[PDB]
Amino acid sequence: VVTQPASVSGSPGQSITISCTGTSSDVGGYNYVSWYQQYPGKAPKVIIFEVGNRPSGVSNRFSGSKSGNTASLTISGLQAEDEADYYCSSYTSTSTGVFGTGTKVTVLGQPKANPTVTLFPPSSEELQANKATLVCLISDFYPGAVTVAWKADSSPVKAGVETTTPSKQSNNKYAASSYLSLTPEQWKSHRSYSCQVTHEGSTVEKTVAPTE
Amino acid sequence: HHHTNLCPFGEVFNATRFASVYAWNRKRISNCVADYSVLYNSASFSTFKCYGVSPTKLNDLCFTNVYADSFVIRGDEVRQIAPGQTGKIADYNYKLPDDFTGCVIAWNSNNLDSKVGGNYNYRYRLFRKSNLKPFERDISTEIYQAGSKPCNGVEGFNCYFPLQSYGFQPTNGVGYQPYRVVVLSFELLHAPATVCGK
Amino acid sequence: EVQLVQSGAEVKKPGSSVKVSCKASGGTFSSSVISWVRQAPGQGLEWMGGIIPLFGSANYAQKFQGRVTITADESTSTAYMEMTSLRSEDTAVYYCAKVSQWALILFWGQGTLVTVSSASTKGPSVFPLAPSSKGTAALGCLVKDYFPEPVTVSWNSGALTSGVHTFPAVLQSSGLYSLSSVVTVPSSSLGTQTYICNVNHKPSNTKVDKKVEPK
Amino acid sequence: AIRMTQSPGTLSLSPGERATLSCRASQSVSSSYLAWYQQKPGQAPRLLIYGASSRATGIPDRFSGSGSGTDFTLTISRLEPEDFAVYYCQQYGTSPSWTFGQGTKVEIKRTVAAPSVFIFPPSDEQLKSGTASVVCLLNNFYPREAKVQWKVDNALQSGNSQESVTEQDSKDSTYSLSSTLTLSKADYEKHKVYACEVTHQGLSSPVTKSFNRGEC
Amino acid sequence: EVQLLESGGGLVQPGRSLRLSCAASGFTFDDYAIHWVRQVPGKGLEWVSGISWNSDTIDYADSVKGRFTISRDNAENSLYLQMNSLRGEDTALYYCAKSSFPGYSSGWYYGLDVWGQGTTVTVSSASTKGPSVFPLAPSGTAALGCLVKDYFPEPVTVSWNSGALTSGVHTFPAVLQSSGLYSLSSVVTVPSSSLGTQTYICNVNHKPSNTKVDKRVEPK
Ligand SMILES: *[C@@H]1O[C@H](CO[C@@H]2O[C@@H](C)[C@@H](O)[C@@H](O)[C@@H]2O)[C@@H](O[C@@H]2O[C@H](CO)[C@@H](O[C@@H]3O[C@H](CO)[C@@H](O)[C@H](O)[C@@H]3O)[C@H](O)[C@H]2NC(C)=O)[C@H](O)[C@H]1NC(C)=O
């Protein structure tokens, strides 16, 4: 078990440090600690080997240190191109190597964008098939974090809820979706259903009704 | 010479300069006696780990041959000079057998080997195709072709020179300071015993 | 910690023998090569022989194989050099030099002066070298006919040290030593300043202060 | 037996220069058992180098030893006034069998200062004892080469004079010499004019200092 | 150049078997050590196995030991990670990496400088399953779309008016439902005045199930 902070954030120009704590059989016993920078959808890149020495072509803004059982990658002068995942790694007494949990490094500064939400009632074709699916589409929002809550009239809905993990679209914004499964009897029993999309403290609520 | 002599341990522990670890020096000690009390009663040592022999007992034993291997390594790399240990130095530079019998002696030598501006005379081997066998020495300086293009004997993109300097400065951390290492190998075989204590 | 201490200076008459001691401290005694080095006045260093206390097997240079014996006493950490049939050519300074088997450095003693002669120890006569009347003037003291070496000469009880040239002694044909000690001073202070040379000869317990006045 | 021959016998250099002293061995000698010593006059030998290249405690970095096999070298990168001395090399080892080189004297090279000459008549108290000693002084000169001729009534002397030289002064790098003519009181009173003639490079002509026996 | 390419991934049922392969080029494969590393999508890395240049030394992670086996053929410059007893936890993207230097553990000493692009291995009890396409009717602009519900495996491809309508089109990432099936919806935004004028048709294509559906979307 080699533990890293789950996420580390910072503004441009600032300096951040990722920790990497291990045992005496890994980061504590051997100076063979290596850091990797992984952009979305690409292979990891060697940034640091042996705690501090950087490969040829690596920006010298990446410094590495070690104290006891804890390695530390330091990124000075955060640039937007540093927003990636960072993984430490070390040799073990078992002659193996082990990887850290990872650290999502997010360079701040981007303006928050509230999501556009569109809620669709069950199509007449699906209700005719003895099924009902409410579709709640969430797009054009940043950062990725967002919370979705469904309501039947004014009381919460328990199950039948499937929701994406937020992912980036073409204009570097996040898009997500949530699906509520219902039987056609449950749909027409309540007067309305609501999709409550909570993102960065603000809630968007769209509502559909069987009769309207 | 075949008549009671002093083991020339001086030209090992006290030499002006040591050899780089990848080209570790070995001197054979035979037919002589030595007062090992001067050794195990010395306080000038930061590492004195013996395996198979008690240190304070070296005067009561006799051996067929004694081998003294000497070199300089980093401070944090000293712990690799031990049976069963692995690492850059143990895999590619100097390797002790699992069944080693002898003692591993080490002391800080920053006062002897570091220079303002960095002393780059001491080197080590970065890599080797396979790990070193116990008591195996590799002094090859052949540039390795790790790429598609032949290297023709010059450093390049994927054309690596197998050795690299340590970079000893007086202001380095202790773990990164030079340490002089001597590896005494006591061999008790079927031959008559020659190197005794007194 | 290691230190070599030799016995005091001696004066032996020709034909006799002398046994110089060398006390070592530090524990590296038994496991060492303890040699004896000799230096005649005006000559270089000469290795006489050595011994290893653990073995007691001494080795000797050919020049000293006959009259020189080197022993060792592990019980007291002391080395000895005994030379018989001493001649005036054996007058020299004798050092015990030691090499420990655990190092390459050499440990030396402070040396022992052995003067070989029969012209018995004698205090020196001190005659003035008066400054001549006819910008700087020279005055001195002639320390003549003493034995053995050495003598110490100061000027005005050490208060005058500038310009003093104390020459090394010469062994006259009489077997007694002689040296001159001079000092150059301004010619204007010859009638004002008092100059007295202080000769001390410790072997004969002789202190002589002589007042050097113009003629 | 192993023979250590040093080269050159004398090394004449100026302060600030680089001194290169050689020590030749008759056989191959292990570089672990070769030493260098510095000796100033009246002092015990000072261990400079041991193990061919290790500097003893307090020895400055400008002294460096090197070599192997049979050729060993002591280099002084920049000569100080205090380094002009005699230097010996020594073969040794873990066996009682050592040898020394004959030595190399490093002395200064010359800037010209002439000697100040003084002659001293024998003291009256010495003449009460039957012996007369005439002392001729050569003061604060350089280079060491100098000639002293004793002249008694313009008759050149020989065999009755002894010379003594001080070692190169640590301050002005000069030498000083004292010649002592010795005559019996009978011979001393037989003659009137006593003179010492000094020949030296710093002198355009030989300088003569004299005195007539009996004059004040 | 130095290059590593992985192949042989796809879908496999729990317990079943699958073999991966790693092709090497641009370096002497005969004297290097290669490793396998896997990555849970959306999370963090984990080491799998390693093999020396002569296969004399082989190590495995404890999560895969006894189940996994590595092997190599230096004549073909190829590395193999034979896989089975596959569990749901074994679903990941599998990398093939090495260090710049020869040496078994040299990858850990100086870092793994050359990776491959990876190969996806999906462990699900999974036969193919085609999707159902429902229209999402619109109720000075309006948003309409169509729903692609319950399918397996990835991916589906959605276009509008046979690709002629690309302005305003947003096709969303799919959900992995607890049932193990995927569901996805694509939506287009069009001006309100053209609802009774223009015809809007979404073109779904799920190649695993050979599904091709053209559903027209129009006001209620
Ligand atoms: C070669 O070995 C000599 C001798 O070492 C001494 O003798 C041996 C027989 C063993 O018994 C050793 O345990 C023993 O120390 C080394 O010379 C010694 O070096 C040390 C450390 O460099 C000196 O100690 C220092 O002294 C200074 C000033 O006095 C103090 O301020 C320090 O605190 C420190 O204690 C020691 O004086 C010195 N001894 C002599 C006699 O020179 C030598 O360093 C070594 N050389 C190499 C290259 O290994």
Residue numbers in the entry:
A (entry chain L): 3 to 214
B (entry chain E): 330 to 527
C (entry chain A): 1 to 134, 139 to 219
D (entry chain B): 1 to 216
E (entry chain H): 1 to 139, 146 to 226
What do the study's own words say?
BA.2.86, a recently described sublineage of SARS-CoV-2 Omicron, contains many mutations in the spike gene. S is made up of an N-terminal S1 domain, responsible for attachment to the host receptor angiotensin converting enzyme 2 (ACE2),2 and a C-terminal S2 domain, which through conformational rearrangement executes fusion of host and viral membranes, allowing entry of viral RNA into the host cell cytoplasm, initiating the infectious cycle.
This antibody uses RBD residues 455 and 456 for binding, with the interactions being much stronger than for XBB-2, and it is knocked out when these residues are mutated.
